[PDB]
Each structure stands twice: as structure tokens, then as C-alpha cells.
């Protein structure tokens, strides 16, 4: 469908657009672009889990002051350090109507799911 906005569930700030999204291994969504790196901060994790396709390194959070809502983890995939976000952490809003949706699982959120390509980086 049309491009869509993802807002910090807790603080509503603008995180990114569906267009910036890319999918790794079919069920891991990351966000291309520098703009997005301006929205979250990484906090190292002392007891990182051990996922299958990537290596966890930290939890990322809304940069916003007095928000710091949990958005997801930051990882090493192949040779890139990239974020991996949780849909539940956001609110999907349609630009032209402001209708906002709360998804709990990407399986249910339906947009153009472009497979992550190292080209774009
Ligand atoms: Zn926030």
C-alpha cells in the first residue's frame, strides 16, 4: 500500500517510514538510513542473547527526553551493525488520515516488504 509512518508508541515521536524498512531472514525488520539513527540510542547489553542469524549487542531506545521507550535491539548482521525493531514498540499512522494502528506482530502488518540487500548497505 501507501508509505506509512511509525511513531514511538509511548512518546509518539516520528521514528521512520515504512519505506525505510527492510526485512532480514523473512522476520527481522531493520531500518535503512541516517535519519533513523538520529531517533534511537544504543545501550550495551551485558548479558546478550544469542540469536541465530545475527549477534545481539544492545537494546535501542527512543532518543527523546523522558521517553526512552524500548524499540528493539542493535545487531551485527553479516558485516553490518544495524538496528532490529519491534512493531509493538510503535504506532502505525496513515499520513493522509491520521488513522493509527497498533500491531503486535509484523505477521499482521501488511506493507511492501523489501528484502534486506547489502547493496543499499
Ligand atoms: Zn519516545
Curated annotation (Swiss-Prot):
Q: What induces or represses this gene?
A: By bacterial lipopolysaccharides (LPS) in endothelial cells. By interferon (IFN).
The cross-link Glycyl lysine isopeptide (Lys-Gly) (interchain with G-Cter in ubiquitin) sits at: 10
Which residues participate in Zn(2+) binding?
A: 8, 11, 62, 67
Modified residues annotated as N6-acetyllysine in this record: 56, 107
Domain of life assignment: Eukaryota
Summarize the impact of residue 86 to R: Decreased ubiquitination and function in RIG-I signaling pathway without effect on RNA-binding
Tissue-level expression:
Present in vascular smooth cells (at protein level).
Which residues carry the post-translational modification Phosphoserine, per the record? Answer: 52-53
Report what the Swiss-Prot or TrEMBL entry states about this protein's PTMs: Phosphorylated in resting cells and dephosphorylated in RNA virus-infected cells.
**Cell location:** Cytoplasm; Cell projection, Ruffle membrane; Cytoplasm, Cytoskeleton; Cell junction, Tight junction
Positions of the UniProt region annotated as Mediates interaction with RNF135: 1-121
Q: Which residues form the RLR CTR domain?
A: 1-121
Record's subunit section: Monomer; maintained as a monomer in an autoinhibited state. Upon binding of viral RNAs and conformational shift, homooligomerizes and forms filaments on these molecules. Interacts (via tandem CARD domain) with MAVS/IPS1 promoting its filamentation. Interacts with DHX58/LGP2, IKBKE, TBK1 and STING1. Interacts (via CARD domain) with TRIM25 (via SPRY domain). Interacts (double-stranded RNA-bound oligomeric form) with RNF135 (homodimer); involved in RNA length-dependent activation of the RIG-I signaling pathway. Interacts with CYLD. (Microbial infection) Interacts with protein Z of Guanarito virus, Machupo virus, Junin arenavirus and Sabia virus. This interaction disrupts its interaction with MAVS/IPS1, impeding downstream IRF3 and NF-kappa-B activation and resulting in decreased IFN-beta induction.
Q: Which family is this sequence assigned to? A: Belongs to the helicase family. RLR subfamily.
Entry note about domains = The RLR CTR domain controls homooligomerization and interaction with MAVS/IPS1. In the absence of viral infection, the protein is maintained as a monomer in an autoinhibited state with the CARD domains masked through intramolecular interactions with the RLR CTR domain. Upon binding to viral RNA and ubiquitination by RNF135, a conformational change releases the autoinhibition promoting further homooligomerization, interaction of the CARD domains with the adapter protein MAVS/IPS1 and activation of the downstream RIG-I signaling pathway.
Describe the task this protein carries out: Innate immune receptor that senses cytoplasmic viral nucleic acids and activates a downstream signaling cascade leading to the production of type I interferons and pro-inflammatory cytokines. Forms a ribonucleoprotein complex with viral RNAs on which it homooligomerizes to form filaments. The homooligomerization allows the recruitment of RNF135 an E3 ubiquitin-protein ligase that activates and amplifies the RIG-I-mediated antiviral signaling in an RNA length-dependent manner through ubiquitination-dependent and -independent mechanisms.
Identify the disorder associated with this protein.
Singleton-Merten syndrome 2: A form of Singleton-Merten syndrome, an autosomal dominant disorder characterized by marked aortic calcification, dental anomalies, osteopenia, acro-osteolysis, and to a lesser extent glaucoma, psoriasis, muscle weakness, and joint laxity. Additional clinical manifestations include particular facial characteristics and abnormal joint and muscle ligaments. SGMRT2 is an atypical form characterized by variable expression of glaucoma, aortic calcification, and skeletal abnormalities, without dental anomalies.
**Name assigned to this protein:** Antiviral innate immune response receptor RIG-I
* Organism (species): Homo sapiens (Human)
Lineage of source species: Eukaryota, Metazoa, Chordata, Craniata, Vertebrata
